[PDB]
Amino acid sequence: GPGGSPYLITGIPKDPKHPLPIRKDIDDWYLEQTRIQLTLFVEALTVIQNRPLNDQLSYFRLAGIHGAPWTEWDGVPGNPTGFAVHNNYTFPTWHRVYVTLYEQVIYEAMLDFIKQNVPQNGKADWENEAKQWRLPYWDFARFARDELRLPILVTMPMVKVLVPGQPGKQLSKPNPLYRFQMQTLMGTLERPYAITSFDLPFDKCQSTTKYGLLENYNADVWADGGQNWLRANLALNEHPWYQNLDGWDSVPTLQDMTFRLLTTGGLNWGEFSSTRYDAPKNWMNLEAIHNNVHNWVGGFMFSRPGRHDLKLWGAGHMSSVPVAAYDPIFWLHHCNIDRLTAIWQTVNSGSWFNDDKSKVSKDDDLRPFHRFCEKTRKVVFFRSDDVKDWRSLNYDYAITKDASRIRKEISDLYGQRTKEVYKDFGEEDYILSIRYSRYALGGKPFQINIFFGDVDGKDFYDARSQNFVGSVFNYSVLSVSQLPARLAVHYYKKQNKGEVPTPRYVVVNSQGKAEAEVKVEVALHKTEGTFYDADDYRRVADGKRAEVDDAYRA
Amino acid sequence: SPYLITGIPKDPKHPLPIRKDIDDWYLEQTSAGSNRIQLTLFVEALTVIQNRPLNDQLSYFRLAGIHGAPWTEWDGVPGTGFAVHNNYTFPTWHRVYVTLYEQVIYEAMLDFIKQNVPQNGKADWENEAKQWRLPYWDFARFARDELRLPILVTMPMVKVLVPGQPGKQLSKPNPLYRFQMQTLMGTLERPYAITSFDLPFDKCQSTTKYGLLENYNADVWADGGQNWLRANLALNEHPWYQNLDGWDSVPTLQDMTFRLLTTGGLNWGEFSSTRYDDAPKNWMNLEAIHNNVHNWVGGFMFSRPGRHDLKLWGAGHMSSVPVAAYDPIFWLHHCNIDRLTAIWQTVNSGSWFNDDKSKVSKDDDLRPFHRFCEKTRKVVFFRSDDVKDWRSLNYDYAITKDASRIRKEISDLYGEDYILSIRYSRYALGGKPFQINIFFGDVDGKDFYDARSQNFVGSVFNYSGAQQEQEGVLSVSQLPARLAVHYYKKQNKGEVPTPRYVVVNSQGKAEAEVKVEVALHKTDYRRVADGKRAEVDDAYRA
Ligand SMILES: [Cu+2]
Ligand SMILES: [Cu+2]
Ligand SMILES: [Cu+2]
Ligand SMILES: [Cu+2]
């Protein structure tokens, strides 16, 4: 660490005037200030982003822990892989520590900012705000203040901040949450830090981008492809195709998935914590939802075959495990994944590494994260049990302050629209199970799209594609996910004399082409009763690969 | 003051330097090799001009201010803007305006060299400044199968040379990407603030393309971004049927530009302007094409009624006369409008303010632009005859260097008939902008906007913004219709379509009360059908 000793991760230190401060919803937090906390977060994160690459607490090196360029960090040596855990049962706990590292570094930068910039009259007030501040979360599953959206702040290129010592003065500055920008293309950073198999030109980017990388544009456009936040919002609101037709109400699949994740009882830790697969009702897991959000924020398709005026594709850092951590929204996404873990823990309190598969991983060192063990007086790595109680890291969430009311809060935040629309149809539920190998395309990402009915051989991509039901993203031993299917099955039955649909799937690569030799096991399952009134699911149809037009075949 | 507009001064090592296609130029600058001196000079000079204070009349803000809001004086001429629209001096007023911008940039390049280039490098850098001319954006040329905004306009940052530190290139914010002020434009010091209008330009710090949408936090409008992919989609507007499987497409903008340049027999009055002062074949004019390009680059619709997951609307500075000049692409669009004028002049050499309609306007003073009169040794305003030969301002275009090959170059670049004629009042909505959309067949009452709307054929944009037009004056445009009539007949038992139109406002609603004269003509063109307004759903009616 800095000054030649391990960097001890503690969370923000405990102050008795500041009992368990909460991580707030970033839109609520911004809206109440649209101002010292906003100023401190902006100015501290700007400093951290501008730190040199040799500084291990620079934004670049902190993001670098996750994936590329796969260097050492804090004395811990660095298919090339990073420190991050994916497709294993420590996925939530490794990321709980990682988010806390980021929050702690930001807090320390806030204190430094105050020491260097704030006059005597205001130091105590500004220090007080730094001590109350916690990293906000992005509630990707909550309607923004009728639709799911990226945070307001992430969509603003500039942000107004206070000028300490100049009352009433504010300055507009580049917003460090909008993008992370380096001084040169990341493929040409000083060794060993160059970002350089990847199937997207991330070596040619200077800044992070959402949907900005498309084939057939000048390579200098890729240096900074922009933040297509409207396109990301569209993706985040994915739902079955039939719901864009007149006379049908829509429900965002991400909100239905999240409501199911939090409300479904009976999962063990191994089922909840990960996509890893060594009863399909239990395949709705945290990591699978997290994987889809990565795709929907960044985009993963660089190209599409054929000629298309409207170009709905485009790729960006958040879809790509090696470089997703560079996008500032990464940390806000993982702050909410940590919040979801804390909520699920609260309503499943005995289910902690409690199954035979996850028990084996409970004691894994969560490298490269150090802490001082007070019992053995040694610097050690974090382990999952150290962070079972997130409050040991001196933060909390409003929703986990009161267990007795958490089930009503879950329903109010995530369940209203699902229940409103589901209530219009009979008392049955349908789900799709999906099982795949994350290595099926040699480690390259891919998207599994499911359809009920005939597939358009030139349009098999998203909610605009005929008969689309939903998607599963391989964000770079098998892997499982689950999709809601209740509403899409109802629509199909109405057009097909009551017949249960055969799920048809297409595996799409980053060129927009269908991969014919990626195995996916898809099935449709039914139970009597609605899921939120809970069941006994039974398989009712087996999946089949769909064919596409010859020009659209990999 | 007065600021004498001359064009870049002549230097015998630089005979009549050309204004290059900005994409070709950008590729030469960055691909030929590392010596990107003209690109560095343009970037650095325009940055300096954009950062000049408001009381400097050669600041970017004040130069853009000549066109429209905030409607102040310039160069001692008291400050409707100075810009000429819907009159026959539209091309010549803008010829002078573009030359002013080019000249100010060149002078700033010379200052940059004085400030930053070492003595032993100054000759090399000055040689590049003296060869540079303002590039044009060829909005009608396929980009190096589709029409596109310039490469450089779509780049947030640009690498430049640092003089005296060889091989050292630095990445800087690109002043062609946007114009960004330090505060919201509605809060600038008197008299310069931009400040009822339907688009929240007072709440913008930066220019935007499609960035302003209703139902987002107002702080998003401070900088709505550059949705250049959405602008490119608009620029490639064509009939809806061409997106069906089996059909090839042809961008309407390229067809319109080809027709503008190759149709013979127009007088200056017909070519130069949308103005119609009381033959439909001759209504394809320079200003109408220019008007649609403004809409396609910027966006004009702030909202849309109803429920839509895919949000294709969004508004931006280039759609709006009062603020369009703030977007740096404005100048590159106008550079190409100047180029199209020069091409048309070359192939129509005796047609210059000499029909009975346009002759009237020939001697208008092109306020606020000054020049020195050698005859009287007095400062005077520019007049159109002063810029009939654009080479007198010491620039040229590659395409007008060899008249003998011009017909073939026009064909290489941009190449029964049916056409649609459109005649409208710019003040049909009191001066507010609107878009006239034309359909062959049934109109979808909730989707009557663009090429994704069923049966869409083409659009006419009113680039304007209770007032009335000049008495006796209206505006005209023309659209190609051959391919669209062929599809319609094929699908509809050979019926010649009745054009159906909708007049759309900035809220995405149909203005039922507006009447436009739309007609279909067929080849020597005969009128074969008259247009009729189409109804839309109740929730989408203004
Ligand atoms: Cu991770
Ligand atoms: Cu993640
Ligand atoms: Cu103008
Ligand atoms: Cu213009």
TrEMBL record, chain A:
Binding site for Cu(2+) 3: H290, H294, H334
Enzyme class label: oxidoreductase
InterPro entries in the record: C11orf54_DUF1907, Di-copper_centre_dom_sf, Tyrosinase/Hemocyanin, Tyrosinase_C, Tyrosinase_Cu-bd
Reactions that this protein is recorded to catalyse: 2 L-dopa + O2 = 2 L-dopaquinone + 2 H2O; L-tyrosine + O2 = L-dopaquinone + H2O
Protein keywords: Copper, Melanin biosynthesis, Metal-binding, Monooxygenase, Oxidoreductase
Claim: Nucleotide-binding is one of the keywords in the record: no
Binding-site positions, Cu(2+) 2: H66, H86, H95
GO molecular function, one term: metal ion binding
GO cellular component: nucleus
Cofactor(s) for this UniProt protein: Cu(2+)
SUPFAM superfamilies: Di-copper centre-containing domain
Residues covered by the Tyrosinase copper-binding domain: 86-103, 327-338
EC number: 1.14.18.1
Keyword Oxidoreductase (UniProt): yes
GO BP: melanin biosynthetic process
Bias (Basic and acidic residues) ranges: 535-554
Annotated spans, Disordered: 534-554
Residues the entry annotates as binding Cu(2+) 1: H66, H86
UniProt record similarity statement: Belongs to the tyrosinase family.
PANTHER family: SHKT DOMAIN-CONTAINING PROTEIN, TYROSINASE FAMILY MEMBER
Full protein name: tyrosinase
